[PDB]
Design an enzyme around this catalytic site. Sequence first.
Site, PDB file in Angstrom:
ATOM      1  N   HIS A 195      -3.551  -0.409   1.853  1.00 37.84           N
ATOM      2  CA  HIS A 195      -2.260   0.080   2.319  1.00 37.84           C
ATOM      3  C   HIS A 195      -1.692   1.132   1.376  1.00 37.84           C
ATOM      4  CE1 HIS A 195      -0.842  -3.140  -0.426  1.00 37.84           C
ATOM      5  NE2 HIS A 195       0.041  -2.209  -0.727  1.00 37.84           N
ATOM      6  N   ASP A 241      -7.601  -5.867   3.474  1.00 35.56           N
ATOM      7  CA  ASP A 241      -6.760  -4.803   2.944  1.00 35.56           C
ATOM      8  C   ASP A 241      -7.289  -4.291   1.615  1.00 35.56           C
ATOM      9  OD1 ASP A 241      -4.410  -3.250   3.418  1.00 35.56           O
ATOM     10  OD2 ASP A 241      -3.432  -4.262   1.826  1.00 35.56           O
ATOM     11  N   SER A 272       2.122  -2.797  -5.833  1.00 35.52           N
ATOM     12  CA  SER A 272       0.890  -3.392  -5.344  1.00 35.52           C
ATOM     13  C   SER A 272      -0.302  -2.858  -6.113  1.00 35.52           C
ATOM     14  CB  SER A 272       0.709  -3.135  -3.867  1.00 35.52           C
ATOM     15  OG  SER A 272       0.453  -1.787  -3.611  1.00 35.52           O
TER      16      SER A 272
END
Lengths: 51, 48, 151
Positions: free
Chosen positions: C29, C51, C103
């Site tokens: 992402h 992901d 992240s």
Amino acid sequence: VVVVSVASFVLLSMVGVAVGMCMCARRRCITPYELTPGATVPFLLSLICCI
Amino acid sequence: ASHTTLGVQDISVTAMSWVQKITGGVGLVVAVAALILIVVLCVSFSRH
Amino acid sequence: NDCIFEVKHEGKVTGYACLVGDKVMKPAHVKGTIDNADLAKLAFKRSSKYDLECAQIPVHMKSDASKFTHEKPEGYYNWHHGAVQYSGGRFTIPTGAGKPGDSGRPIFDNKGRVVAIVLGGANEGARTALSVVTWNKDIVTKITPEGAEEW
């Protein structure tokens, strides 16, 4: 017409019953998992009872 | 001609046998590949 | 630590890539490229299911990759931006402890091993549950709290 109409109605009714029993069986089999915290639902049950 | 005309379904028995073997051969390859993909996907959904 | 590389977007840092074991792991992402040209030119394999974008580390010139473990006992772990609590099957931090752009940050155990990679989280009120990448003895798994957002 009477035999066909009645026989058709009864056969459809019995199908509705077969489905209703499946819905009842599904609800009862699943319930304990919906109540229990964590609820690690096994893969086979997930596919078999749609959960 | 005293006889009528033929359709596409009126090929010879030998020709039909060849068509079935070729069609079955390819269909089998697809059926197997499809089964493998289905199994892999089912496993992939068993690892969620 | 010091195995963390920035992922550069056109005008900002949007996340980090971490070196774990023999692979460099980046959240899918996160958009942008790795700041270090040696990793930026490295091919990655993407998986929308986990992901992740992972690639083999050029270990011949990258021996600083972190150690990792599959072991996840209940207790506290160190994730750079604070302490993260592990309970049940989830990692939990204070709601203000993390934010978008964080992240790619790893969670370390008390022995310095990488346990999980942070993808995002869900605000549960007093605490936020993290969406993380973890691994068992065999394969990588993904844990996502309901309502979790990508960071």
